[PDB]
Structures are given as structure tokens and as C-alpha cells.
Design a binder for this molecule. Structure first.
Ligand SMILES: CC(=O)N[C@H]1[C@H](O[C@H]2[C@@H](O)[C@@H](CO)O[C@@H](O[C@H]3[C@H](O)[C@@H](O)[C@@H](O)O[C@@H]3CO)[C@@H]2O)O[C@H](CO)[C@@H](O)[C@@H]1O[C@@H]1O[C@H](CO)[C@H](O)[C@H](O)[C@H]1O[C@@H]1O[C@@H](C)[C@@H](O)[C@@H](O)[C@@H]1O
Length: 160
């Protein structure tokens, strides 16, 4: 039985649970910060978009990012910085036919998926303040224990 769907909210995800977000839409999918050394946002770009400048609100502030996606898959850009005075930079990308995006707090690190479905894999950003990372989701989501991560990886890559 799936733990969800839950509607968009700001919360503090517990350690060792995947938050799996089911985006139908373009724009910001999630954003998270501990206000110290992690700011992350995942931004969705629909299929077959030629190069263009778009505006996104990250933590209440408007940013202009130039995007492109000539694929028939959706593209999710992971934007990141580790300091409040820095600018957001593109760190990684997930290219997806399923439109599911994941985040996980585990083992002193923050985990997301990247690469291209059906072979998306996990990678991490480091932090010395993991517990304090909160997230705001902009679409409905499910919660899946890390003990069942192979299921979450299956969903990411082949659909709910
Ligand atoms: C190898 C592994 O288990 N991969 C896991 C990944 O594990 C990390 C994680 O636990 C971090 C925590 O900070 O520690 C890493 O290990 C450290 C170790 O403590 C020290 O030796 C240190 O000095 O260095 C190493 C490495 O830096 C662990 O390796 O955790 C992530 C987040 O949950 C998992 O996504 C990842 O799991 C693998 O993911 C692959 C896709 O990228 C692929 O799907 C693999 O099948 C998958 O592994 C399988 O599932 C895991 C959840 C776990 O059950 C593993 O045993 C299993 O093979």
C-alpha cells in the first residue's frame, strides 16, 4: 500500500525515508534548505523545448535560468548551492519518462536521483546539518522507507 498521496507542504522529512514526488507539471518541483550549507531546488522542463530563458521562484526570490530540452522525456535540473551568498548552480540532471523525483536524508548526506530512466541512479550532496533540512513540495508525493529503496528506484525508473 502506498504511503500517500500527500498534498504539497513544507516539512522536515525524517531520516531514512524517500520522499517521492509525482510531478505532472513544469516549474519548481521541490526546494529544500537547512539555511546553513544546503539549498537545493529541482526544476522540471517539459519535452521538446528549444533554448529559452525562464523565471523560477527559489525560496521566495525570482531567478532567471536558461533551459533546453530537445528530448521526448521530461528533464529535471537539480540546482544547488552551499552558501547563502552564492548563486544557484546546475549540479545534476534526471531525464525521465515517469516524471517521478526523489529526495532522501541518509547517513550524513542528501540523496537524489540523476541520469536517465530506466537507469536512474542515486547520488548525494554533503552537509554537516542533515537533520535540519526541510523541504517544500509543489506536487503530490509518497513516502517510502529506505529499507524499501529498490521499490522507490523501480518507481523512479518505470512508473508508479
Ligand atoms: C553501496 C550502497 O549501499 N549504496 C547505497 C548508498 O549507500 C551509501 C550510504 O549508506 C552512505 C551513507 O553516508 O555510506 C556509503 O558507504 C560509505 C561507508 O560508510 C564508508 O566506507 C565510507 O568511507 O565510504 C563509503 C562510500 O562513500 C554507502 O555506500 O546509499 C544510497 C542512499 O540510500 C543508495 O541509493 C545506494 O544504493 C545503491 O544504489 C544504486 C543506484 O545508485 C543501485 O540501485 C544499488 O542497487 C543500490 O544498492 C542496493 O540498495 C541499497 C539501498 C543497499 O541496500 C545496498 O546494499 C544494495 O546493494
Amino acid at each position: 500500500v502506498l504511503d500517500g498521496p500527500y498534498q504539497p507542504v513544507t516539512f522536515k522529512p525524517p531520516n531514512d525515508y524517500w520522499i517521492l514526488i509525482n510531478s505532472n507539471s513544469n516549474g519548481v518541483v521541490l526546494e529544500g534548505t537547512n539555511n546553513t550549507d544546503v539549498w537545493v531546488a529541482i526544476i522540471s522542463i517539459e519535452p521538446n523545448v528549444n533554448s529559452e530563458s525562464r523565471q523560477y521562484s527559489l525560496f521566495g526570490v525570482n531567478k532567471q535560468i536558461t533551459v533546453v530540452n530537445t528530448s521526448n522525456k521530461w528533464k529535471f535540473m537539480e540546482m544547488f548551492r552551499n552558501n547563502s551568498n552564492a548563486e544557484f548552480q546546475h549540479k545534476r540532471t534526471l531525464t525521465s519518462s515517469t516524471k517521478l523525483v526523489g529526495i532522501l536524508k541518509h547517513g550524513g548526506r542528501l540523496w537524489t536521483y540523476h541520469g536517465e530512466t530506466p537507469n536512474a541512479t542515486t547520488d548525494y550532496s554533503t552537509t554537516s546539518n542533515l537533520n535540519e533540512i526541510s523541504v517544500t513540495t509543489y506536487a503530490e508525493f509518497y513516502i517510502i522507507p529506505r529499507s524499501q529503496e529498490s521499490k522507490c528506484t523501480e518507481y523512479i525508473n518505470t512508473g508508479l
